[PDB]
Write a protein that binds this ligand. Structure first.
Ligand SMILES: [Ca+2]
Ligand SMILES: [Ca+2]
Ligand SMILES: [Ca+2]
Ligand SMILES: [Ca+2]
Ligand SMILES: [Ca+2]
Ligand SMILES: [Ca+2]
Lengths: 220, 217, 220, 217
């Protein structure tokens, strides 16, 4: 489906499902990593899907610091909250029930308000405020770089707008089993993930890359 | 408590409501002003005999423009409404149970969501915050708003005295009479600095001659 | 020129220059004061100039707390700064000189930057940053409600977009002399100012107002 | 200083540059990870014999994504550039005089303005702030940026050790060699946790057997 293509490359590389990509040469390795952080419209490196429609900065999700990756970023949390709200909208028997419950709870407070001396006014209580007040956030149970990768994988999956995930030099932290559970999940869930590796990652189906930008396959 | 300074033979006593007329245009302006710039060694003094710090004094000049929806005041209102429920365990308990139901319907959405989500609680305080309860001021009459200023004043426990500058001019005798009753009832300490005599309530007067009188007792 | 007109009024009141306006009745007094704080499009009270073009919330400047009035509000300061900048633009021989001076001063710093280890980049230094850095602000010398009124008057004058000033119940703080110096300045500077007073302000030309909304003049 | 924990017969010594290879995939991951969650009683230890607090340790995993334009770092850069002038009184003095001229042309505009305006001074620090001097990163190579991380590291005096996780993979031997020279020259203390041997520099190795070796001395 997806392509990694730029000037110095013979053929555009296929990014289909899980994909390990070795860049033997230290210089091509950094060049490519860095062209990744530097990804933008004006960029050396182009990623695009089958329809040749190019993946934008925003659609890529790039991880080098696996531990550092924040699963409860505000950006993620806003989305989750907004998402949980729209779940309600699609079950109208429950939004009705939420509505009745808030309407009632509101009166009971306004009751105390009327009771209070002050001329007190008020707005409404929204589903979002309830979710936000409840403190819904992503579970952080993973206590290992490996467990973490899976969570990053889960989240990547969860963000429908993030289309490609790139782990950079992540092989270093992963038993052959772990790498396989990962690729397992990635097959299972239909994720396009790229692993920019500096050396061969065990004996998994994977692509390699000369200092000359010549492309061999391996372990098929 | 007391108001004192150098020109006064003897300090002025501030229990509950205390109306102070200054009829010398220039002494009115000096005293209102000294009040406003009040500090540790200001020319003008206030005390219990421990002197009131500035921070323990609120001063209202512009009534309608005074913000009674300050954070500290909201925070206070809100904990007060909450605590109104601790007097009504019956209803509070229903609220706990209603909140539990919302919680459950939300957690169910949380499970049904692909992500492994955790959560905490929803508290009555959060519901109150969420509801955006605040004092309504936008339509007020000066009188209505004086009352609100008084009502919020009771909360600021830190503050010991509230001063009203030249508010009389805006008030019907009956309105003034209301606020006295309320001041008296709420065990509050309040001063109205006036240019002129305020109808016929008990009040103090200092003239051009600087002779301090007492009236309508 | 300007008019104070609303429903309960016989004739629209002329606001020309300084203007004292007594509202004998406690109720009409508050009603009117309050209709002032509550001024907006949907409002009881209308102010408009000669061309019957109505003065907006923003064009009025309403003072009850004379001491409290902040002459160094951010809003005032932004304007002053922006204004001082445009002074420069209109003296091109001086903007040239400012320009030469900054361009030079910049190099001398960039010089130190080049000298510094780090790859350091930089932007520019603007006239505004110079003004802001210099800490230009309005002088606060007035140590009396009276001195203050004059400063508020100066500022009112300074804001070309603020078209009417209303002092509310300010008479209370003002010797007959002071009131006169004020009206003096207001004549001198061409200001439209209104003094909502609850009682007669000495013996100055002024308008009075019945509990019935009947309008007499006085002291002409 | 030193890195120590339970599996090590004897602590590892951290003077200047110190490269530490962990070749057991699982011990690499454990140690990188322990580093990251380091605290008071973490499994992993660091000390002078007073242990380094977490706050005294900076850790780089994502090189290009690390923010060297932090407030604390800018604040520091800027006071350093200023102080570069105190070594050049001649030029500084011209700058004082140039600034005085701008000041004067501004004050003149201040007088010419209808309002009575006051003012303070313009300082070199303000000019530097205004100028928006910061480290340029936007075009960096990983190597270039390591260098900048090092260069800013010298400033944070609070921090005692900087750790680089698995940065080797990105670096030419000659690039690595550069950063060693610079570390050595700047009297800095630095650790590179590596999965594999880093070319042929002096470095420490811990294997699957957990046998600690020393190499290329
Ligand atoms: Ca709300
Ligand atoms: Ca909560
Ligand atoms: Ca009200
Ligand atoms: Ca700038
Ligand atoms: Ca300055
Ligand atoms: Ca650079």
């Amino acid at each position: 489906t997806m392509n990694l293509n730029f000037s110095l490359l013979d053929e555009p590389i296929p990014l289909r499902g899980g994909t390990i990509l070795v860049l033997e040469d230290v210089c091509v390795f950094s060049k490519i990593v860095q062209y990744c952080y530097q990804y933008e419209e004006d960029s050396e490196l182009k990623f695009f899907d089958h329809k040749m429609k190019t993946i934008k900065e925003s659609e890529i999700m790039l991880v080098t610091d696996i531990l550092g990756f924040d699963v409860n970023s505000s950006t993620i949390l806003k989305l989750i909250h907004a998402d949980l709200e729209s779940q309600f909208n699609e079950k109208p028997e429950v939004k009705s029930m939420i509505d009745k419950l808030v309407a009632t709870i509101t009166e009971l407070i306004v009751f105390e308000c009327l009771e209070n001396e002050l001329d007190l006014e008020y707005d409404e209580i929204t589903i979002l405020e309830l979710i936000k007040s409840l403190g819904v956030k992503v579970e952080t149970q993973s206590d290992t770089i490996f467990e973490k990768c899976l969570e990053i994988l889960q989240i990547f999956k969860y963000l429908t707008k993030k289309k490609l995930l790139i782990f950079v030099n992540s092989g270093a932290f992963l038993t052959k089993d772990e790498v396989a559970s990962l690729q397992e999940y990635i097959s299972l869930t239909n994720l396009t993930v790229l692993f920019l590796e500096p050396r061969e990652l065990y004996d998994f189906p994977q692509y390699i890359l000369d200092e000359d930008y010549f492309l061999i396959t391996k372990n098929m």
